[PDB]
Amino acid sequence: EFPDYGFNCEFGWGSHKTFCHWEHDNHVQLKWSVLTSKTGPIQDHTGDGNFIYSQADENQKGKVARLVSPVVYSQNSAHCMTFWYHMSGSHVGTLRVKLRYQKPEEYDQLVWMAIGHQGDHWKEGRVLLHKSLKLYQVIFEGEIGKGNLGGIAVDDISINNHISQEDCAKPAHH
Amino acid sequence: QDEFPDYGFNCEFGWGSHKTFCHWEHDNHVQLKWSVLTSKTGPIQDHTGDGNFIYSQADENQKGKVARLVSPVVYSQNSAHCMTFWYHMSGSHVGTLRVKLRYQKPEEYDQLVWMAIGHQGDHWKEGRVLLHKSLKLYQVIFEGEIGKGNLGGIAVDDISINNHISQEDCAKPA
Ligand SMILES: [Ca+2]
Ligand SMILES: [Ca+2]
Ligand SMILES: [Ca+2]
Ligand SMILES: [Ca+2]
């Protein structure tokens, strides 16, 4: 199959919500919720209904949640990170992917970003996890929008693919 | 006129036991056909969607024969379109992949516009072909020439017209 890197996450199934080996960042005010949704317009039909969610809420506007991956095995190969996201609504918020390094000190490098409405359906995002001797973790950062309908969903984060490096990158269409 | 791609041209080849060529058709004058496979195991899969794809197996006994899949008519009188697709060609003798434009009757002819021969890499790659503006209408052909390889084959997936790529960006090394 593929090596057990501990990196992938579907966020479980109906009788089991999980963040796998990912962790909530303790430098920010909110965290991502794991939902099981078998109703309404945002669902995980392929994976028995579980995803993470950052609800738009004018009262929480501009606070962030950050989910932080295990350290990426980045030394021999690059990886293509794929994930799915759902950002419907004009004030749904902002989703950023960052690479967190340790060594000058701990700092974040912005590599992917989607601001506001992206469409009324799930979309595929991809980010190349470049080869690097300097070690890093991946961060999914949800910034709460002012809308009062919906929010940012993310699901099915994976490096289990054989996608060429040059074609990996799939930015947000805004 | 302007929504034709989603009427059978754009094709992911279905999902699970829904195996489909959308509105693409087998050329019947030719000996072999492409097959739709469901992603189960092995290194060739539509991993990111858990989806289907098309495949032309290498087989030394059919070396040099072709399977030909023929698109619906492209409406090209008013504009060019960027067609993107994915392909997987691993093995020195995996065969040859050709994209042709078959211009409409009378005075039908086939114009070759994209060809890959032999080993391209152990991973999915993205092809791009600019479907030029033309008064004479045409169909796109995906043509798989059987390699003499004993393992593997040419896989293709996720053919689409993407009108947000400009003509200069409708190209590899990009
Ligand atoms: Ca899921
Ligand atoms: Ca899913
Ligand atoms: Ca597919
Ligand atoms: Ca795919």
Author numbering:
A (entry chain B): 642 to 815
B (entry chain A): 640 to 813
Task: Quote the original article.
Here we present the crystal structure of the MAM domain of human NRP1 at 2.24 Å resolution. To overcome this issue all residues that are potential substrates for glycosylation were changed to aspartates to exclude heterogeneity while maintaining negatively charged features of the protein region, thus partially mimicking the effect of glycosylation; this protein variant was named a non-glycosylated MAM (ngMAM) domain. The electron density maps allowed model building for residues 639–813 in chain A and 641–815 in chain B while the N-terminal region (residues 628–639), which contains four of the mutated residues that would be glycosylated in the WT protein, as well as the (His)6 C-terminal tag, was disordered. The crystal structure of the MAM domain of NRP1 comprises a variable N-terminal region that contains a short α helix connected through an extensive linker to a single β strand (βA), and an adjacent eight-stranded β barrel organized in a jellyroll topology, with the strands named B-I, followed by the short α-helical turn at the C terminus. The two Ca2+ binding sites are present in both MAM domain molecules within the asymmetric unit and stabilize the domain by bridging the residues from the N-terminal variable region to the first and the last strand of the jellyroll.
They are composed of five extracellular structural domains, named a1, at the N terminus, then a2, b1, b2, and c, followed by a single transmembrane helix and a short cytoplasmic tail. Instead, it was proposed that this domain supports dimerization and multimerization of NRP molecules and thus contributes to the formation of signaling receptor complexes (Nakamura et al., 1998).
